[PDB]
Amino acid sequence: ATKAVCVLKGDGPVQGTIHFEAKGDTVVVTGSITGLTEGDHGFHVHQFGDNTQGCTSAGPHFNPLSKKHGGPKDEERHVGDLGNVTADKNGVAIVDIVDPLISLSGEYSIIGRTMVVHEKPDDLGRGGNEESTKTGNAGSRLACGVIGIAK
C-alpha cells in the first residue's frame, strides 16, 4: 500500500488535495491547499475517518504512542502532528513534508484517518496552557478529508 490521497473539504472556501507516497523508509506528503488566510495553519492527522458530523467527528490527533502534542521535529509529539502549512497572500499553501512517524501500512498507518487543516497556527505544544499540549491552540477545522488508498 504505497500511495494515498486526501481531498480536503469544509463549510467554507478552503479546499485542497494532499498526496502521500511511501518512499524508501519514509512518507512524502505533497499537494496544496487554497482559500486560506495568509500565514500559518495547523495541519494534522486525526484519529478517525469519521465525517458524520463534519470535521468534528474525526476526533483527537492520531496518537498511538500516547504522547503530548508537539511540532513534527519534537521527540514528544502525536503521530498526527505535522505542524503548520503556510499560505501566501493569495491564500495558497504548498505542502511538501517528509515525516518519520506516519506510515501508509501497519500500526502507524494513516489510511482511513482524517487530514485536517486548521484556522490558526499550531504553537507546536509550546503555548503554555493545557490546550497547547492537546491541539497546539490551532483552533477549529477549516477543511478535512478521509485519507484513501490511491493508484
CA distance 38 to 65: 33
**8 A C-beta contact, residue 77 and residue 125:** yes
Active site residue 61: yes
118 is in an annotated binding site: yes
Alpha-carbon torsion 60, 66, 70, 73, what sign? negative
Minimum separation from the CB atom of position 59 to a second copy (A): 7
In the bound state, the residue with its beta carbon closest to Cu ion is 44
By CB under 5 A, is residue 118 in contact with Zn ion? no
Residue 135, classed as helix, strand or coil, is helix
- Look up residue 3 and give its three cell numbers: 500511495
44 is in an annotated binding site: yes
Active site residue 41: no
Question: Any idea which residue has 512524502 for its cell?
Answer: 28
Residue 127 or 148 having the CB closest to a second copy: 148
Task: Let me know if 150 is exposed, middle or buried by CB neighbors in 10 A (0-12, 13-18, 19+).
Answer: middle
Widest CA span in the chain: 43
With CB under 5 A as the contact rule, the residue among 69, 113, 118, 141 that binds Zn ion is: 69
Q: Which stretch binds Zn ion (CB under 5 A): 21-29, 30-38, 58-66, 111-119?
A: 58-66
Contacts with Cu ion, residue ranges (CB under 5 A): 44, 116
Active-site positions read: 44, 46, 61, 69, 78, 81, 118, 141
Contacts with a second copy, residue ranges (CB under 8 A): 1, 4-5, 7, 17, 47-52, 59, 111-114, 145-151
